Design a protein around this ligand. Structure first.
Ligand SMILES: O=C(O)c1ccc2c(c1)nnn2C1CCCCC1
Length: 301
């Protein structure tokens, strides 16, 4: 059982490296962020360019959607996050408090909170409605590379170049577990909240059992020794792990067997980010400056 992702559209418009692509929860849009200081919105199905959202003073590392698909949050080298109304393109709030680049961001499922991680080694939890910081967690001893809420919002997982992943109780800010030293470049909870997928800068993805603090699966064969490359759980068809790679390919693994099931050829630079559509077997991928495009791919399974 293998997927058959094939290229459907190639999207161009950003003028510097893309950093992150994300499909809206309602499936209608793809958002992209870039070192060019811009967010772009594209039709998720035909790639049609929709709008540019602008206001950050420096490049953007990440963007994330609210559960109702109406809001975006972005994390910027200007040391702020911004909350955006997607329909109007307007900045609703600027979240100030980090003392260096903000690298990662996510809403909780309820979408009343945002979590951020920064070069400043902290994780912050913000109130969406007021735009004020509720908690600053002294989370890591090196830049924070990823932050993600679990399925009900009760926990946050963070990762850092310090080699650690940490699980935090959202309401209290207490660290409930540290997974233990290669730099960790990405982390997220599995859909059921019981596992955690982590990328490290030694060409390795790992699936950890949260309750046991133990690694259950590793996924290798790709190249990842430099860039923050996200990894995804693909769940609409076959159960895969999806990731970009520094050899210009999208890698897709069987989650259970760890075997590579497809390598998507087409980009001409590092595939820095990938995202999986919430209902269709559709992948978005973005590549670095020799390539300059976002590609949309479709599989029958
Ligand atoms: O939906 C999810 O979050 C999810 C999480 C882990 C899953 C899964 C679905 N299907 N199989 N596995 C195994 C991974 C390897 C260890 C035993 C479980």
């Amino acid at each position: 059982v293998k997927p058959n992702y094939a290229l459907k559209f190639t999207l161009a418009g950003h003028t510097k490296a893309v950093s992150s692509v994300k499909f809206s929860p309602n499936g209608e849009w793809l958002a992209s962020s870039s070192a060019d200081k811009l967010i772009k919105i594209w039709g998720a199905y035909d790639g049609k360019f929709e709008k540019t959202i602008s206001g950050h003073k420096l490049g953007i590392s990440d963007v994330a959607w609210s559960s109702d698909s109406n809001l975006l949050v972005s994390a910027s080298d200007d040391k702020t996050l911004k909350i955006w109304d997607v329909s109007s393109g307007k900045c609703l709030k600027t979240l100030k408090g980090h003392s260096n680049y903000v690298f990662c961001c996510n809403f909780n499922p309820q979408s009343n909170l945002i979590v951020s991680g920064s070069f400043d080694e902290s994780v912050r939890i913000w109130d969406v409605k007021t735009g004020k910081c509720l908690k600053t967690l002294p989370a890591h001893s090196d830049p924070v590379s990823a932050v993600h809420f679990n399925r009900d919002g009760s926990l946050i997982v963070s990762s850092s170049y310090d080699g650690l992943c940490r699980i935090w109780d959202t309401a209290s800010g207490q660290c409930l577990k540290t997974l233990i030293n290669p730099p960790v470049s990405f982390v997220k909870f599995s859909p059921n909240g019981k596992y955690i997928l982590a990328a490290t800068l030694d060409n390795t993805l790992k699936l950890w059992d949260y309750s046991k603090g133990k690694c259950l699966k590793t996924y290798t064969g790709h190249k990842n020794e430099k860039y923050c490359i996200f990894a995804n759980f693909s769940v609409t068809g076959g159960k895969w792990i999806v990731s970009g790679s520094e050899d210009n390919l999208v890698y897709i693994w069987n989650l259970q067997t760890k075997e590579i099931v497809q390598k998507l050829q087409g980009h001409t630079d590092v595939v820095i980010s990938t995202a999986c559509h919430p209902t269709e077997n559709i992948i978005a991928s973005a590549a670095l400056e020799n390539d300059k495009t976002i590609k949309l791919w479709k599989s029958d399974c």
